[PDB]
Amino acid sequence: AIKYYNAADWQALPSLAELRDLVINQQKRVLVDFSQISDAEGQAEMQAQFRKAYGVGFANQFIVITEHKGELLFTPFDRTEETNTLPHVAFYISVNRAISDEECTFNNSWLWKNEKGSRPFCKDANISLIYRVNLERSLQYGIVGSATPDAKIVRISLDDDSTGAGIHLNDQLGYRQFGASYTTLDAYFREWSTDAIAQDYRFVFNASNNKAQILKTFPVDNINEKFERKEVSGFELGVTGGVEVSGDGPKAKLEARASYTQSRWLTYNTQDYRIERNAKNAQAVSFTWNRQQYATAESLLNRSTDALWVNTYPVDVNRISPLSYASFVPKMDVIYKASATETGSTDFIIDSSVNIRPIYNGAYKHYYVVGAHQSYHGFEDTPRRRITKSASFTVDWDHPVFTGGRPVNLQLASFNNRCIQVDAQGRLTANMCDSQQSAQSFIYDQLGRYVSASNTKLCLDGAALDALQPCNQNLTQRWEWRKGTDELTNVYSGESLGHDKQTGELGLYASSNDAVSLRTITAYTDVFNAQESSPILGYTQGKMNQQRVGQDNRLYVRAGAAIDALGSASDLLVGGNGGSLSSVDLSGVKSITATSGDFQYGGQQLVALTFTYQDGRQQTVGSKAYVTNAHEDRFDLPDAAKITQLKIWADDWLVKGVQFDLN
Numbered sequence: 001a002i003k004y005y006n007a008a009d010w011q012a013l014p015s016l017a018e019l020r021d022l023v024i025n026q027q028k029r030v031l032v033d034f035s036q037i038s039d040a041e042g043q044a045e046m047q048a049q050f051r052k053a054y055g056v057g058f059a060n061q062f063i064v065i066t067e068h069k070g071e072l073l074f075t076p077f078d079r080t081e082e083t084n085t086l087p088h089v090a091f092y093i094s095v096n097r098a099i100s101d102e103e104c105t106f107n108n109s110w111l112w113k114n115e116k117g118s119r120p121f122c123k124d125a126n127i128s129l130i131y132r133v134n135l136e137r138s139l140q141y142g143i144v145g146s147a148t149p150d151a152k153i154v155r156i157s158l159d160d161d162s163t164g165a166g167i168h169l170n171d172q173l174g175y176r177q178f179g180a181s182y183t184t185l186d187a188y189f190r191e192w193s194t195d196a197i198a199q200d201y202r203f204v205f206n207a208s209n210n211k212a213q214i215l216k217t218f219p220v221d222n223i224n225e226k227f228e229r230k231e232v233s234g235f236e237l238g239v240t241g242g243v244e245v246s247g248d249g250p251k252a253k254l255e256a257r258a259s260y261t262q263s264r265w266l267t268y269n270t271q272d273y274r275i276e277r278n279a280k281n282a283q284a285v286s287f288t289w290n291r292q293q294y295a296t297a298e299s300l301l302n303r304s305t306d307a308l309w310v311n312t313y314p315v316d317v318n319r320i321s322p323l324s325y326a327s328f329v330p331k332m333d334v335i336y337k338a339s340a341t342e343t344g345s346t347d348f349i350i351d352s353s354v355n356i357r358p359i360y361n362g363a364y365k366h367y368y369v370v371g372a373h374q375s376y377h378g379f380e381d382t383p384r385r386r387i388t389k390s391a392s393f394t395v396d397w398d399h400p401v402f403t404g405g406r407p408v409n410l411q412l413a414s415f416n417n418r419c420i421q422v423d424a425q426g427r428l429t430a431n432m433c434d435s436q437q438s439a440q441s442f443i444y445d446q447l448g449r450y451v452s453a454s455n456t457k458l459c460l461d462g463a464a465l466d467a468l469q470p471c472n473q474n475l476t477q478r479w480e481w482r483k484g485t486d487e488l489t490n491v492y493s494g495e496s497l498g499h500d501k502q503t504g505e506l507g508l509y510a511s512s513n514d515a516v517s518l519r520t521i522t523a524y525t526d527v528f529n530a531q532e533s534s535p536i537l538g539y540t541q542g543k544m545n546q547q548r549v550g551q552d553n554r555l556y557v558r559a560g561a562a563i564d565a566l567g568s569a570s571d572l573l574v575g576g577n578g579g580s581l582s583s584v585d586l587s588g589v590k591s592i593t594a595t596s597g598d599f600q601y602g603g604q605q606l607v608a609l610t611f612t613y614q615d616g617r618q619q620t621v622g623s624k625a626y627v628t629n630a631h632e633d634r635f636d637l638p639d640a641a642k643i644t645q646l647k648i649w650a651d652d653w654l655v656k657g658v659q660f661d662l663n
Ligand SMILES: CCCCCCCCO[C@@H]1O[C@H](CO)[C@@H](O)[C@H](O)[C@H]1O
Pocket: 559, 560, 561, 562, 563, 564, 577, 578, 579, 580, 601
């Protein structure tokens, strides 16, 4: 049931929430058509409205929108072919390309190219992939040298949790035999052309301009053949944090108070292939799965000589691993960054391909005089054909999600609690509050400015309160709340934002009068469900890192006389480098008890965590043998509660405290 839409009709457009509800909640498959628009100006306008509304744009004529893993899935074409922790836009890009017989066709023979004809070397060859994309902001957190970056992020990846079907070339590898059309005494007389495999699989990532640079990727370098392992690619972003470290709520200025490690799980099983990483420059990087094991036709020979009366296929096709033609599922993670103040747009292109390689071997007839025989050989300089499928998406660096802040409103208490709202021209009015109206949403940024969420280029300016103004560095655009009151003050003049109780007109005042109120109420416009969690066990000292509990549902630790580090994976440990690695199962945990006190080797420390499970079993990390004047904080998990996130406080040497979030 595809719900067709002619974009030309909107030149008179549904919000993101509306689209997600129709596609995700109502499982409706949507098809947006841009090919009916009459001219370039009209197309550019709608394209601009489309991406401004949904956070992503395309230049393609058709866009199919479906659901995938709880997010929107965009399938563009031209012809008939965590949120509580980090604000972000997540979606997927689908790519499906059928490889035609013509595209898989090669000569039946190599030695006799123009004689034996040609045939398709693959059956139902296909490329079906799904790319996960996240648009998000990272704030600077930590000391210069070991801090998270202050940067707008575009993260693209092919991971275990959202992967598409993969690349297919053949179900099985068959062959055909051929022979010289002339007499032979000492020369090649027979040949076998085997169905094609992938000499390589390649994925190229590039950005359309220099506004974006590659920050990190996974793999970070080359990966050898016969490499089998589930890897984790973690990227640490500075975030504003919640109640555990930002006691001001909606009035808190955009500031990093913790870091968060967003992880992508990547399963590798390279077998015959080695993975070669190549970063040509700051905008482009490619990952190529190249045959390393049994890479030549010669290597496939399972016999070398025979008498002339033997006519047997001299190849052992079982030496070829199935990921070479049956099913291949790539895994990678690419993280692009742009400056904190970047503007405009950037396109990201993904080139996915398979280098199709037919296989040729021949038999050489040797003449000795008294006795003759044949020898088998492989031909390597034979034809290969790369079939590529590209896709691109456009990103606007001014999208509100890139501010890293949460939308909030400004309510005039004495004016029937109305919300300040901005129209297209930037004029201000006061209307009934409505969370579904972005025109009432603002981001309270780093400078203390109130940036319109519906147009990040405009700001609340004391210089002219009749309309928002192009954001700048002037103090007239920075606001500061007076603690203990509902009064919002202007940094430049020190006055308070007041509103006439009857007309709603805005102005700056030294104090309220009979006709004017200085009471401004602000609230988050997004509805956030309460997060249940244990108290902070231990001490709230040092930096805090947040990590989601992995699929393996285990807590990783390095400890000795105290607790050196903790993490959701052995490769994502936070804390010092001492202690010895250990692991704790989180399923069945009924209660957790932390031990803190005077540490034998200095100061106060969290020295141990004891976990008690439903069956009574207990496991402890750290020790109680090097602490005196100890104190025990015990947390009992609510019935059926499961640990899903970890908040870890640590300094350069030890974990200082931890908090466990539930469900
Ligand atoms: C941190 C200062 C430790 C001084 C001597 C400690 C002897 C106990 O053992 C030590 O405990 C440390 C803390 O967990 C670990 O980091 C060390 O690897 C471990 O050997």
